Design a protein around this ligand. Sequence first.
Ligand code: H3B
Length: 371
Amino acid sequence: NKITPNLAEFAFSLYRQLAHQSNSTNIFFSPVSIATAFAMLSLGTKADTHDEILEGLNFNLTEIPEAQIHEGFQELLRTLNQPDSQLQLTTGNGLFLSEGLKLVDKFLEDVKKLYHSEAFTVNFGDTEEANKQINDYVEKGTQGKIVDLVKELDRDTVFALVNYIFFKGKWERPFEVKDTEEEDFHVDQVTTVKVPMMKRLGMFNIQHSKKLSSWVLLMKYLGNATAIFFLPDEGKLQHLENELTHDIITKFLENEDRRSASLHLPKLSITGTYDLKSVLGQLGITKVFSNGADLSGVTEEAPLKLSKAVHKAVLTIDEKGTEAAGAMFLEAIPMSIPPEVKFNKPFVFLMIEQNTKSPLFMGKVVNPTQK
Ligand SMILES: C[Si](C)(C)CCCS(=O)(=O)O
């Protein structure tokens, strides 16, 4: 897991930027899917264009050889696409290139073989039809969960990147639907809204952190992933966001102790849609989106730049995530008063791949029913 510390720093860099833009919008994105897509794209770039991308993903190119970077991403893709996988993770990356371009076979080989991604040729001379084919690809890739992703292409587009990911996990220890009820969610210190709130009494991997001034809950999904929820103390949301570090997360993941608690956790259906040209440009990735881009690994003779780049991530959290009966189990609950831990005010969360400890998702809920 040589690249996991880098992915974690990329997740935090990207989160802190998005959190700076607006503090009153839900956030949800996939550090892994974005980083994988641009590590892949770098295989078609050279010199400064190439270095900017990998440096913008938090790789210090004076310290880590590039071979270890791509080997880390490929080993990560190997775990996320295992056939027998209950994790049910739907992600894709689509490269849409002008059909008039003479493409380098090596790049198309690396895209398909090394990164198991998709590259298409489109007539960008028909802007509306190209837009439709881009949206149809995403819509088909998500069986209709993500529709009308790209809303506008500029006439001069010759190369577009769409990165999508949809996740609805199945809890190893699920909630009972009968126990879900409408509860208050404190959007601020004097204001509440009603939201569907799951609840369960059980033995949870839960603790209060003095360092983070937050409750920290870890819940495992069927498959190879764990959700980490951070509930900041009154007035500590910003402190929480500032103090998160990869080392702090690792310590939580290594703790397996469980304690009784009465957990209240909102059902969630949230999405995040980001213009990666804008967002990654704030992290230093600019030349690949500019006329000066060195994409000679993609096409040798003609100029090229990445004109459009979008990420959309969709999250569903509910009681079971499936209609099938799960494996039954019994937890031994002591008779002492369980703490009441209610995720009923803004909180942060992170989903981690158990094998690599990579950050599959990161987000913030400011209002579950915001839209
Ligand atoms: C939490 Si409240 C009802 C004062 C703002 C809701 C606006 S929106 O999310 O519907 O855009």
